[PDB]
PDB file of C-alpha atoms in Angstrom:
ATOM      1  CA  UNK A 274      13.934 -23.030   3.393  1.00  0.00           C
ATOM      2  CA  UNK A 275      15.555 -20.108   5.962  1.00  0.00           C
ATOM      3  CA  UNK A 276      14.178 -19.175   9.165  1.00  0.00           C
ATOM      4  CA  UNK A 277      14.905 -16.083   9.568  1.00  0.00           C
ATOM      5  CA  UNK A 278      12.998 -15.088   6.433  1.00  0.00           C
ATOM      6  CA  UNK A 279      10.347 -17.370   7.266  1.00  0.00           C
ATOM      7  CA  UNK A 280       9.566 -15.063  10.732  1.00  0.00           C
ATOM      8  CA  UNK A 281      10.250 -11.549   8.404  1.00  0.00           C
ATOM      9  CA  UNK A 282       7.670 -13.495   6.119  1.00  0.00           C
ATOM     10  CA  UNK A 283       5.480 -13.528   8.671  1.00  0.00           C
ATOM     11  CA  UNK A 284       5.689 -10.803  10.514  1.00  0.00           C
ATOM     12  CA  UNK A 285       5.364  -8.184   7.361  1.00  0.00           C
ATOM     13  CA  UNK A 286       2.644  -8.224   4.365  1.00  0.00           C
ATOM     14  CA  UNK A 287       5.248  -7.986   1.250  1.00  0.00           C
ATOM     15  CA  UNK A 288       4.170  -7.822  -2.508  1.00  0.00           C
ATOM     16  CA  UNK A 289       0.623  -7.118  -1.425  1.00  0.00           C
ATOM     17  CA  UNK A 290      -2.098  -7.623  -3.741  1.00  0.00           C
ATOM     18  CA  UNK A 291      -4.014  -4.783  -3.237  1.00  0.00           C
ATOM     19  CA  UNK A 292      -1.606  -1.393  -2.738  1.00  0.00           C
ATOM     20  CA  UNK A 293      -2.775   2.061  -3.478  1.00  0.00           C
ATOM     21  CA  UNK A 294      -0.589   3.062  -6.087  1.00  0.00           C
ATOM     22  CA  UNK A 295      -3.083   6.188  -6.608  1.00  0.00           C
ATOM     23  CA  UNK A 296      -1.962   8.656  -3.727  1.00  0.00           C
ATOM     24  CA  UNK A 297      -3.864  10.902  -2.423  1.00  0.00           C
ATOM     25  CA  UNK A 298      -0.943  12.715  -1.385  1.00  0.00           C
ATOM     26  CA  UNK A 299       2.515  11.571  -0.293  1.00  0.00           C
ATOM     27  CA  UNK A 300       6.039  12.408  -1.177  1.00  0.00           C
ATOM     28  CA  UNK A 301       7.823   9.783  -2.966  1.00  0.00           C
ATOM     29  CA  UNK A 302      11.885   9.624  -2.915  1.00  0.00           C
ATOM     30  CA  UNK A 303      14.863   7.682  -5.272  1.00  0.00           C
ATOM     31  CA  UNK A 304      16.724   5.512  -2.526  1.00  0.00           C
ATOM     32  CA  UNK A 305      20.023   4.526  -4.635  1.00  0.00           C
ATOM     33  CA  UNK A 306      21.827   2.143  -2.290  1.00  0.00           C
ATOM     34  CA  UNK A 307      25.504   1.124  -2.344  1.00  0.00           C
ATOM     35  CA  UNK A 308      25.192  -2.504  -2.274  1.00  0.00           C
ATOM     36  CA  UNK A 309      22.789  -5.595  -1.799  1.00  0.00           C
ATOM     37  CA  UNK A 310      24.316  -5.942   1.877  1.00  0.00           C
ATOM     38  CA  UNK A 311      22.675  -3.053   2.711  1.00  0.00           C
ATOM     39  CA  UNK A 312      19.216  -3.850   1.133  1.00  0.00           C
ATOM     40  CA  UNK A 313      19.325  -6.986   2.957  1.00  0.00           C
ATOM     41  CA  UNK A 314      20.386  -5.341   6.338  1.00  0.00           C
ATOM     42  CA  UNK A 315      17.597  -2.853   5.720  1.00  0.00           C
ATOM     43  CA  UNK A 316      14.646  -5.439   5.045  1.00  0.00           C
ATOM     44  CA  UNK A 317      15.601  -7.597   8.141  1.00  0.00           C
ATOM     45  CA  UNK A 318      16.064  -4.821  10.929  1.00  0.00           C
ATOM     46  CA  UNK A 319      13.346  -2.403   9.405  1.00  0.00           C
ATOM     47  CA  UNK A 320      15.847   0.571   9.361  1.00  0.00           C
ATOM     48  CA  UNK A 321      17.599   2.131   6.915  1.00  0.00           C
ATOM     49  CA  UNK A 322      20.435   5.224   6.768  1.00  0.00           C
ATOM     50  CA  UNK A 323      21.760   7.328   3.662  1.00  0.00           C
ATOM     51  CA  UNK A 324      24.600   9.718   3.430  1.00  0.00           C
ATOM     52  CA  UNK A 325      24.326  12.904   6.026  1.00  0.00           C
ATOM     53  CA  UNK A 326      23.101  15.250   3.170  1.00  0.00           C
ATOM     54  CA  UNK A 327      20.302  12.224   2.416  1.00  0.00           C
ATOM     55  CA  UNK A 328      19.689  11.703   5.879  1.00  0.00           C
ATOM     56  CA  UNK A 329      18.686  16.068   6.482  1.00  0.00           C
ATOM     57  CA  UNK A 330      16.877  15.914   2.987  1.00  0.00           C
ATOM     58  CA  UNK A 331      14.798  12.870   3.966  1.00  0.00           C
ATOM     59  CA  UNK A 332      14.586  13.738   7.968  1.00  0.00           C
ATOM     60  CA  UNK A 333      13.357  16.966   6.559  1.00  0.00           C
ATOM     61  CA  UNK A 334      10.369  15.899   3.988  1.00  0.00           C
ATOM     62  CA  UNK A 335       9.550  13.135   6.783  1.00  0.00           C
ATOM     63  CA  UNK A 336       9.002  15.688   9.018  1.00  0.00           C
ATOM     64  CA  UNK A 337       6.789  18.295   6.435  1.00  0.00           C
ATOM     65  CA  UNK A 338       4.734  15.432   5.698  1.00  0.00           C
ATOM     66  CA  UNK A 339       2.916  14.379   9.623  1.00  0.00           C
ATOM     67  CA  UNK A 340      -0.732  14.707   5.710  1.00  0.00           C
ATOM     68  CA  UNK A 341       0.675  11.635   4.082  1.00  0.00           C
ATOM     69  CA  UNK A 342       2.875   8.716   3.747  1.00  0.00           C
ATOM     70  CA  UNK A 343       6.652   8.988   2.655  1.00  0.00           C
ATOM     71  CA  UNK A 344       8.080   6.041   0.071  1.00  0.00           C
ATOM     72  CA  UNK A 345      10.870   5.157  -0.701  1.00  0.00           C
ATOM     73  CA  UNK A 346      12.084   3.296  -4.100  1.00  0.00           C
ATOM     74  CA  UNK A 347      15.308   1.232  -3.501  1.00  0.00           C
ATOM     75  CA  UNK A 348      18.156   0.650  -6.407  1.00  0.00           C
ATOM     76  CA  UNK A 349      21.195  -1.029  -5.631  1.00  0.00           C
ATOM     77  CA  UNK A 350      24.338   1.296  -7.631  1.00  0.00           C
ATOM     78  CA  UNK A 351      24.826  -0.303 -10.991  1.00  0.00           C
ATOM     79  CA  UNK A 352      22.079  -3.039 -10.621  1.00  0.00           C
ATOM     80  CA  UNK A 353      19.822  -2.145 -13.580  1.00  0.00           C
ATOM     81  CA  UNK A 354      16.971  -2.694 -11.593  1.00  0.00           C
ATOM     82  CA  UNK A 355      14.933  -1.464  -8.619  1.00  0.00           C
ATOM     83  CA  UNK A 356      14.464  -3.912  -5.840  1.00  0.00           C
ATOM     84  CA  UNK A 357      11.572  -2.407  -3.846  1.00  0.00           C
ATOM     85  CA  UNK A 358       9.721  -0.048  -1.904  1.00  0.00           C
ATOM     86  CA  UNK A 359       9.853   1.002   1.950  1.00  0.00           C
ATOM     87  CA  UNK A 360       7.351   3.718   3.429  1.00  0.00           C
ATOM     88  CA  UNK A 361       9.457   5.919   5.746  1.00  0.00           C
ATOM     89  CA  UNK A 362       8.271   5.473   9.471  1.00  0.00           C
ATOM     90  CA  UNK A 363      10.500   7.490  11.623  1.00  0.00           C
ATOM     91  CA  UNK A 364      12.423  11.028  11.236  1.00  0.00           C
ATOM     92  CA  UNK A 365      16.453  10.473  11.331  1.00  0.00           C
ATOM     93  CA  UNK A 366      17.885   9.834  14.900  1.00  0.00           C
ATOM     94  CA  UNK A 367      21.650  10.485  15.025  1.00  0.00           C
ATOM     95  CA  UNK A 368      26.115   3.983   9.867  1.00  0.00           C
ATOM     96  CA  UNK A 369      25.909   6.896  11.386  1.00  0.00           C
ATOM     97  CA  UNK A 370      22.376   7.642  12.090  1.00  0.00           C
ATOM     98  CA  UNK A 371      18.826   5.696  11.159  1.00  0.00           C
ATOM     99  CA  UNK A 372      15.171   5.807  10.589  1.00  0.00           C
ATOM    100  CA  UNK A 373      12.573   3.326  10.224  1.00  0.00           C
ATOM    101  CA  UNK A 374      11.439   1.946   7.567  1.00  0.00           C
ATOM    102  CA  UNK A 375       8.557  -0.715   6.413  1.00  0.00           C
ATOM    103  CA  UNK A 376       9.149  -2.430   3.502  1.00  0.00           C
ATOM    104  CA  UNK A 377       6.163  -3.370   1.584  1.00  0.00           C
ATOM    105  CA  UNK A 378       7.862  -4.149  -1.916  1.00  0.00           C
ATOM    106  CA  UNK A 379      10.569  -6.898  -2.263  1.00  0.00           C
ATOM    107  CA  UNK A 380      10.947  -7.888  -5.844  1.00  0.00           C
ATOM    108  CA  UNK A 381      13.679  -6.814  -8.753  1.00  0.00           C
ATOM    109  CA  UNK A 382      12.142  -4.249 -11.614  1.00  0.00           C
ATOM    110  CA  UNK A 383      14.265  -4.144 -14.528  1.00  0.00           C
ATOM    111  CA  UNK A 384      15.055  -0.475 -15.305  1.00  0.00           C
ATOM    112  CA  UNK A 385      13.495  -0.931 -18.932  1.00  0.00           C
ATOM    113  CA  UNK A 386       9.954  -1.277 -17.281  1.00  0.00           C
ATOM    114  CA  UNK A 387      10.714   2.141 -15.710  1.00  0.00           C
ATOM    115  CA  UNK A 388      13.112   4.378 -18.268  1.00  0.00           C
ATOM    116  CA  UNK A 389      10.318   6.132 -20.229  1.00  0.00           C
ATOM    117  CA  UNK A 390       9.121   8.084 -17.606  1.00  0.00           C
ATOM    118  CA  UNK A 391      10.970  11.211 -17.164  1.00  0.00           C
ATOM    119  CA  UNK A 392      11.864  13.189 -13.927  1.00  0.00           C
ATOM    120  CA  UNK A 393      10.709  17.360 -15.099  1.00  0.00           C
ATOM    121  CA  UNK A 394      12.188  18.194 -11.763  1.00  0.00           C
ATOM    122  CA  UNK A 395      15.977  16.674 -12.944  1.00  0.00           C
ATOM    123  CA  UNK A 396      16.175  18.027 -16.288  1.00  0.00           C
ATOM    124  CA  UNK A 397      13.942  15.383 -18.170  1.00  0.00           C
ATOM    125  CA  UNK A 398      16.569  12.472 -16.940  1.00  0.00           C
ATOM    126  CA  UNK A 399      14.768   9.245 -16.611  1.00  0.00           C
ATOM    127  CA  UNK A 400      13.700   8.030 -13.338  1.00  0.00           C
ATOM    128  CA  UNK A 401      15.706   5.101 -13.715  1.00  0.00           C
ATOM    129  CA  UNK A 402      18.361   7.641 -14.257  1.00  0.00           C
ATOM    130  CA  UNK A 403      18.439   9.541 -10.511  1.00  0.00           C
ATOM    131  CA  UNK A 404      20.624  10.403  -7.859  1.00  0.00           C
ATOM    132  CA  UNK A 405      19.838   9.173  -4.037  1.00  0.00           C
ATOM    133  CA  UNK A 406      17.310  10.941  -2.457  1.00  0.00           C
ATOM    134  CA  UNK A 407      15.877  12.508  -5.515  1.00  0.00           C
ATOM    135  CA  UNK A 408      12.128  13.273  -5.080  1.00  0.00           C
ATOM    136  CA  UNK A 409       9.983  12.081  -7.867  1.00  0.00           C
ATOM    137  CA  UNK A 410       7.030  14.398  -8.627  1.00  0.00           C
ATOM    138  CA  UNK A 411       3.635  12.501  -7.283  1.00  0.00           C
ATOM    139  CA  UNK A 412       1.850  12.180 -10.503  1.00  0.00           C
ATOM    140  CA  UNK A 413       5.289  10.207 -11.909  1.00  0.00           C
ATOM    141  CA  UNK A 414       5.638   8.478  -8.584  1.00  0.00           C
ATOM    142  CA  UNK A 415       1.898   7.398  -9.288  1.00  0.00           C
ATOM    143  CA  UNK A 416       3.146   5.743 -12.144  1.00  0.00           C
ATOM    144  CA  UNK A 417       6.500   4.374 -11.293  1.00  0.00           C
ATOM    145  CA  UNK A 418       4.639   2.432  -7.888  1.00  0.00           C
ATOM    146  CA  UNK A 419       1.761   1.263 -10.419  1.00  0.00           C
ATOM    147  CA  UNK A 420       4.442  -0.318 -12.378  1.00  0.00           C
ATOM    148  CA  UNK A 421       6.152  -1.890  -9.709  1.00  0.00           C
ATOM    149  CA  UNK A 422       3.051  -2.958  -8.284  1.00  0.00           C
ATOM    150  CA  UNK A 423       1.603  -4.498 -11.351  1.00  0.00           C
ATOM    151  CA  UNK A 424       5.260  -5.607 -12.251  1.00  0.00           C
ATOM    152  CA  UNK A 425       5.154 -10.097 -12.055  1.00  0.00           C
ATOM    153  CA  UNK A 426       8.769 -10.460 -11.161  1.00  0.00           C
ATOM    154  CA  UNK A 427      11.170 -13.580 -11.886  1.00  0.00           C
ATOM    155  CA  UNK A 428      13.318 -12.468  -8.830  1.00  0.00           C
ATOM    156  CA  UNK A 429      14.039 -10.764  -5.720  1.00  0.00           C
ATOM    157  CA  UNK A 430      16.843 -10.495  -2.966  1.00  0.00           C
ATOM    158  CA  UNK A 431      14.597 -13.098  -1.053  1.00  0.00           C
ATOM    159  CA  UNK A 432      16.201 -15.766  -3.685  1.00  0.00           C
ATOM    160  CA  UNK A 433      19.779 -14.286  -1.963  1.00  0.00           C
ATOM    161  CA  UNK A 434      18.749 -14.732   1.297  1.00  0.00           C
ATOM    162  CA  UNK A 435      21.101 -17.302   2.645  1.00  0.00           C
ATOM    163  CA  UNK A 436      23.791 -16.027   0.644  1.00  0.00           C
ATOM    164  CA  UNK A 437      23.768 -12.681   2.662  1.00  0.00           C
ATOM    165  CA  UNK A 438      23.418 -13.903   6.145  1.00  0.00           C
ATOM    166  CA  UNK A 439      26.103 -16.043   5.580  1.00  0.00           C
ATOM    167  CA  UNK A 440      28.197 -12.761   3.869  1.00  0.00           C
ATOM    168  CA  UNK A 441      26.962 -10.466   7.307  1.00  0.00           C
ATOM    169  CA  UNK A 442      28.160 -13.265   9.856  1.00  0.00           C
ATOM    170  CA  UNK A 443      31.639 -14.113   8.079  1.00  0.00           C
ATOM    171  CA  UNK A 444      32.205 -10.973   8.187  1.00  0.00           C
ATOM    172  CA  UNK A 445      31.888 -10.137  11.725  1.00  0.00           C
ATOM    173  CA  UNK A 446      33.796 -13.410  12.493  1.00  0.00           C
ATOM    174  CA  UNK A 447      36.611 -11.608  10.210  1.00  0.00           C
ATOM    175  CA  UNK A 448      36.333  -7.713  11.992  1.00  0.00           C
ATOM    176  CA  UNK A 449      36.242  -9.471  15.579  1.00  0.00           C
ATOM    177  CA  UNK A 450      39.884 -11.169  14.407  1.00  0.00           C
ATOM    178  CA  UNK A 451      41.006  -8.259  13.201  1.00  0.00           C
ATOM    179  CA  UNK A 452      40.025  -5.751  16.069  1.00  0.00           C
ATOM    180  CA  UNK A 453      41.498  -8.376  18.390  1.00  0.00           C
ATOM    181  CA  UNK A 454      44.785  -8.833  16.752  1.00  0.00           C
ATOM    182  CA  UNK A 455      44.379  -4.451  16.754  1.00  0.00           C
ATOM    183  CA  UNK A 456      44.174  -4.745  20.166  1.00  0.00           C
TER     184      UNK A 456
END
């Protein structure tokens, strides 16, 4: 093959070799996402928008941190598996809103590579266990992007790539028809 991915290929470094798992310092965030659309949507526009509590939470810790990068780990609702990582690149501007992201991880985890380590700051709960825009403690998020890192993956939403841009532009076909016949 697609061309599209082919020029996103290109134009980004994903599933590098070397990535500094070891932070120096950083705050690291659960991104739990309500469907694959919006992962895809996300990789190929290089934005990415949560609820508005998510959104003042993130815009927030983006803004405390001007000292150190802010990542974001992406789950799709239900999946069983993470899907990748995104640094943060731009506080929210007012889906309803946006930032910027830059993904640098594209590739499915299964949650039991990540399950036995526990969040202290959500009552012990696994990580794989969170809530959207829970923070992960650094020394855990050390571990969790070491694991993804390290983590030789069978698939990723890459594999899906055709089968989404052809979801995203039926579906605009099929809101145009319907805001004409609306109107």
């Amino acid at each position: 093959s697609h061309p599209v991915l082919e020029k996103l290929k290109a134009a980004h470094s994903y599933n590098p070799k070397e990535f500094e798992w070891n932070l120096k310092s950083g705050r690291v965030f659960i991104i739990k996402s309500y469907s694959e659309d919006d992962i895809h949507r996300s990789i190929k526009y290089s934005i990415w928008c949560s609820t508005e509590h998510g959104n003042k939470r993130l815009d927030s810790a983006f803004r405390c941190m001007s000292k150190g990068p802010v990542y974001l780990l992406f789950s799709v609702n239900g999946s069983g598996h993470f899907c990748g990582v995104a640094e943060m690149k731009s506080p929210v501007d007012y889906w309803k809103g946006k930032f910027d992201v830059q993904w640098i991880f594209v590739k499915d985890v299964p949650n039991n590579q990540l399950r036995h380590i526990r969040l202290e700051n959500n009552d012990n709960k696994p990580v794989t266990n969170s809530r959207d825009t829970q923070e992960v403690p650094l020394e855990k998020a050390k571990q969790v992007l070491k694991i993804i890192s390290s983590y030789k993956h069978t698939t990723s939403i890459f594999d899906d790539f055709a089968h989404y841009e052809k979801r995203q532009e039926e579906e605009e076909v099929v809101r145009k028809e319907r805001q004409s016949r609306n109107k």
